[PDB]
Amino acid sequence: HMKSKLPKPVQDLIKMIFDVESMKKAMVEYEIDLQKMPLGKLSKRQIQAAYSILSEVQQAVSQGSDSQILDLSNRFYTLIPHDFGMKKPPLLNNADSVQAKAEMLDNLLDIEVAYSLLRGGSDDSSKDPIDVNYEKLKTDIKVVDRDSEEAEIIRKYVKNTHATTHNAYDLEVIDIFKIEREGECQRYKPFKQLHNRRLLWHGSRTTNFAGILSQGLRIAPPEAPVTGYMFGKGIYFADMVSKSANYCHTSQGDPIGLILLGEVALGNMYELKHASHISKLPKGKHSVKGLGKTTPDPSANISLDGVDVPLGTGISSGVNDTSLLYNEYIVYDIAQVNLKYLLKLKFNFKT
Ligand SMILES: CCCN1CCN(C(=O)c2cc(Cn3c(=O)[nH]c(=O)c4ccccc43)ccc2F)CC1=O
């Protein structure tokens, strides 16, 4: 084939995110039986139906029996086959079970998008599959120059906001990409001048990124159990890089991760200390801020293309009896996010 003119960093990004074996590896990490639910038999209606049963399990837990729970639990495993041999699988009888399974289904949604791009489309041997898969993302991806100002600011954001409690690893930035999802700037127009626009982190596993770049960061569907998400069903960001980087789920056996920086239109924040599984914001609010005990030093906020970058070292916020060690930001309308960068990260595990 004609060999692809894309920058090498862009080619390795495309290799990573469309890797079929990585998708499978993620699935067996969630204890899915690939013999019964292979990557190709995954579909949206199966994932949604599973979400609903998980909403049934949520209902039965909120009103307290291991007798009547058993039936709902089994119905879940019926829709998403798990790898337990001749079994009796573990009972899904608590809030932790619901959170953990909702998170798995979130990932399956993104994996199904990635695989549907791969199996949709055309076959032409004379094109480099790298170029072919790139086009499927409908996302302009450029390499940001190491010596630019934007690169310096980004590396400082990474350098300054790694929490002491996440010190089992550190981060080097391998590549910085500037990204522009088709139509996202247009979608963002209503919020582009809103106050309190902040450049924030969103980490995810590499097997979700094809989904993210083609479909954007998204709201979990109606069927998903609201109780599975600490501040309900929205799009979550952090101001501490390590808090987001934990969601990459890197390890000693695959240490390269991907993390986003999005411009988030937060406006009037509904400030919370503890879990609130809301399905709408109070009138007049545009976002939830989950209040951390620690925050980037607000005096070291810097501006990048008119957007605040909270890149100060972590200090005490002053908030007292909070569930959150660090800040968290949630929006509930997809149009409040404009994705700006994508970093490839090297994780040095010190353990
Ligand atoms: C439903 C499609 C896939 N999906 C999964 C849900 N989602 C989220 O942003 C989300 C993400 C998380 C977990 N999470 C996360 O995965 N990455 C983060 O950087 C993060 C930062 C602060 C708090 C949570 C974070 C929890 C609940 C969520 F709703 C956006 C999203 O598009």
From Swiss-Prot:
Changing residue 208 to S: 4% of wild-type activity. Residues 3-119 form the PARP alpha-helical domain. The active site is at 328 (for poly [adp-ribose] polymerase activity). Promotes AIFM1-mediated apoptosis. This form, which translocates into the cytoplasm following cleavage by caspase-3 (CASP3) and caspase-7 (CASP7) in response to apoptosis, is auto-poly-ADP-ribosylated and serves as a poly-ADP-ribose carrier to induce AIFM1-mediated apoptosis. It comes from Homo sapiens (Human). It is found in: Cytoplasm. The gene is PARP1. Changing residue 239 to N: 0.6% of wild-type activity. The chain holds residues 662 to 1011 of 1014 of the full protein. This is Poly [ADP-ribose] polymerase 1, processed C-terminus.
